[PDB]
């Protein structure tokens, strides 16, 4: 429980309740390699919410790609998680989601956005701890970031997510 409690504190420390989340991934080179080697294919981010008692969500990233992006792109997905107040929320989840890889020189951020596929299993009320992740398989070419550029600085990158609150 001592370590279990530390995990709760860490999660609380990262949570946000306004639909905006900035995910800092440090030790980039090491994690990048664990992905290339297949030892650790993906990483889940801490959870964040649309409001104090809104939808619970997180992100999932494949530093060496998933599906159509395997081995060639950084794949980034959105995840709807089972939240404590799901019974009070409207389903399926239907908020626009914006995903970004921040340029640490504020020159040119990588950005993409999508509206949920209402008929998809990914956006129905969660029965399990998490629904299947959905998003961008070809979010960013491995050469784009990683290599040089200004996305990786001091061995860390920043991923940003913005969940539109229209209707909430």
């Amino acid at each position: 429980a001592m370590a279990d409690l530390e995990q709760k504190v860490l999660e609380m420390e990262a949570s946000t309740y306004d639909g905006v989340f900035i995910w800092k991934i440090s030790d980039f080179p090491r994690k990048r390699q664990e992905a290339v080697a297949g030892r650790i294919p993906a990483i889940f981010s801490p959870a964040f919410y649309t409001s104090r008692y809104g939808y619970k969500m997180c992100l999932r990233i494949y530093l060496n790609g998933d599906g159509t992006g395997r081995g060639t792109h950084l794949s980034l997905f959105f995840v709807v998680m089972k939240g404590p107040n799901d019974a009070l929320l409207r389903w399926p989840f239907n908020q626009k989601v914006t995903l970004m890889l921040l340029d640490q020189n504020n020159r040119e951020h990588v950005i993409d956005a999508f509206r949920p596929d209402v008929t998809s299993s990914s956006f129905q009320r969660p029965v399990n701890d998490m629904n299947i992740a959905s998003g961008c398989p070809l979010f960013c070419p491995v050469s784009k970031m990683e290599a040089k550029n200004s996305y990786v600085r001091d061995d860390a990158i920043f991923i940003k997510a913005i969940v539109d609150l229209t209707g909430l």
Partner: peptide, 5 residues
Amino acid sequence: PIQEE
């Protein structure tokens, strides 16, 4: 959106 594989 496209689901992860």
